[PDB]
Curated annotation (Swiss-Prot), chain A:
The modification N-acetylalanine is found at residue 1. This is NADH dehydrogenase [ubiquinone] 1 alpha subcomplex subunit 7. The gene is NDUFA7. It is found in: Mitochondrion inner membrane. Accessory subunit of the mitochondrial membrane respiratory chain NADH dehydrogenase (Complex I), that is believed not to be involved in catalysis. Complex I functions in the transfer of electrons from NADH to the respiratory chain. The immediate electron acceptor for the enzyme is believed to be ubiquinone. Residues 31-51 are annotated as: Disordered. Its main location: mitochondrion. Belongs to the complex I NDUFA7 subunit family. The modification N6-acetyllysine is found at residue 39. The chain holds residues 2 to 57 of 113 of the full protein. It comes from Bos taurus (Bovine). The lineage of its organism: Eukaryota, Metazoa, Chordata, Craniata, Vertebrata. Keywords: Acetylation, Electron transport, Membrane, Mitochondrion, Mitochondrion inner membrane, Respiratory chain, Transport.
Curated annotation (Swiss-Prot), chain B:
[2Fe-2S] cluster binds at residues 36, 47, 50, 64. It is found in: Mitochondrion inner membrane. It comes from Bos taurus. Core subunit of respiratory chain NADH dehydrogenase (Complex I) which is composed of 45 different subunits. This is the largest subunit of complex I and it is a component of the iron-sulfur (IP) fragment of the enzyme. Complex I associates with ubiquinol-cytochrome reductase complex (Complex III) to form supercomplexes. Interacts with MDM2 and AKAP1. Disulfide bonds: none annotated. It comes from the Eukaryota. This is NADH-ubiquinone oxidoreductase 75 kDa subunit, mitochondrial. [4Fe-4S] cluster 2 binds at residues 148, 151, 154, 198. Belongs to the complex I 75 kDa subunit family. Residues 80-119 form the 4Fe-4S His(Cys)3-ligated-type domain. Core subunit of the mitochondrial membrane respiratory chain NADH dehydrogenase (Complex I) which catalyzes electron transfer from NADH through the respiratory chain, using ubiquinone as an electron acceptor. Essential for catalysing the entry and efficient transfer of electrons within complex I. Plays a key role in the assembly and stability of complex I and participates in the association of complex I with ubiquinol-cytochrome reductase complex (Complex III) to form supercomplexes. [4Fe-4S] cluster 1 binds at residues 96, 100, 103, 109. The modification N6-acetyllysine is found at residue 56.
Length: 56, 230
């Protein structure tokens, strides 16, 4: 038998609680193509005035 | 017997009267970033990069211009000297094209080595950049006057040492073109030295053109044959 309902009882019985968190575990919440094009933020520089290398 | 004691960062050095600030700094081991000054050529205060602040003075004087008198404490690493070098470097590169990949000069470039060490990391610049129409000077010297920083060193070279008198400044402000106005084919003796005189990639060898970058080729010393002087 390959039916999940009866098998899930066996794997839970034989040492420790299972059911959730599978071996494969790549079904839901796996985002393909990452995200829409983002904008990377700038640090303490980039913005002009008082950006001398004498201070840095 | 004709010797003046002066201080470079507080260190004693003896110099001949008439010598410049940069000449006095060469004695101790210091080297102020420069663009116009040359060991063989004359003195002009064009670019104003060799700014060095001497204490008890309101304005910063160039290393080219001032002759050293008695009692000066030349400060090379002060708060104002660093801001002077960072300032002018931003002005020099505001109206200079992004040509480092297409430039014949690579690692040998004076603008590259100095802007990394003395100049600022980032530029405030937003809009501008002037473009200069290139003039065909000769088949021996390739000339792209867009990259020229109007330093006036080649003009002095052709006038004082080469003695040909063809190059000259034409126009005012941004619109200043270095070169011959009459579009004359400049070919004379010592014309293969003007490519080495120019600190930037404005004047370059046309027969050499594009083959290797300065860092890639291994240098070897040799005496040149087929010449009387050697
Ligand atoms: S002259 Fe120097 S800084 Fe200017 S494009 Fe050529 S390599 Fe780059
Ligand atoms: S072509 Fe070169 S040497 Fe002549 S003024 Fe321009 S930067 Fe200076
Ligand atoms: S190098 Fe001295 S003013 Fe240009």
């Amino acid at each position: 038998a390959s039916a999940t309902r009866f098998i899930q009882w066996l794997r839970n019985w034989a040492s420790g609680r299972d059911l959730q968190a599978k071996l494969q575990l790549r079904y839901q919440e796996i985002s393909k193509r990452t995200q829409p094009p983002p904008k990377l933020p700038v640090g303490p520089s980039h913005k002009l005035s008082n950006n001398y290398y004498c201070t840095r | 017997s004709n010797l003046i004691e002066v201080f470079v960062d507080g260190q004693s050095v003896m110099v001949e009267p008439g010598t410049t600030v940069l000449q006095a700094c060469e004695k101790v081991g210091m080297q102020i970033p420069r663009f116009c000054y040359h060991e063989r050529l004359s003195v002009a205060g064009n670019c104003r990069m060799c700014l060095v602040e001497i204490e008890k003075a309101p304005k910063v004087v160039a290393a080219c211009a001032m002759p050293v008198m008695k009692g000066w404490n030349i400060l090379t690493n002060s708060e104002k000297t660093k801001k002077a070098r960072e300032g002018v470097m931003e002005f020099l590169l505001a109206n200079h094209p992004l040509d480092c990949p297409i430039c014949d000069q690579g690692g040998e470039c004076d603008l590259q080595d100095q802007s990394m060490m003395f100049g600022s990391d980032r530029s405030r610049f937003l809009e501008g950049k002037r473009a200069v129409e290139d003039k065909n000077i000769g088949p021996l010297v390739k000339t792209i006057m867009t990259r020229c920083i109007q330093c006036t060193r080649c003009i002095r070279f052709a006038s004082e040492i080469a003695g040909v008198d063809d190059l000259g400044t034409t126009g005012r402000g941004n619109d200043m073109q270095v070169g011959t106005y009459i579009e004359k084919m400049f070919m004379s003796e010592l014309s293969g030295n003007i490519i080495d005189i120019c600190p930037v990639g404005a004047l370059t060898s046309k027969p050499y053109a594009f083959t290797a970058r300065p860092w890639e080729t291994r240098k070897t010393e040799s005496i040149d044959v087929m010449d009387a002087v050697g």
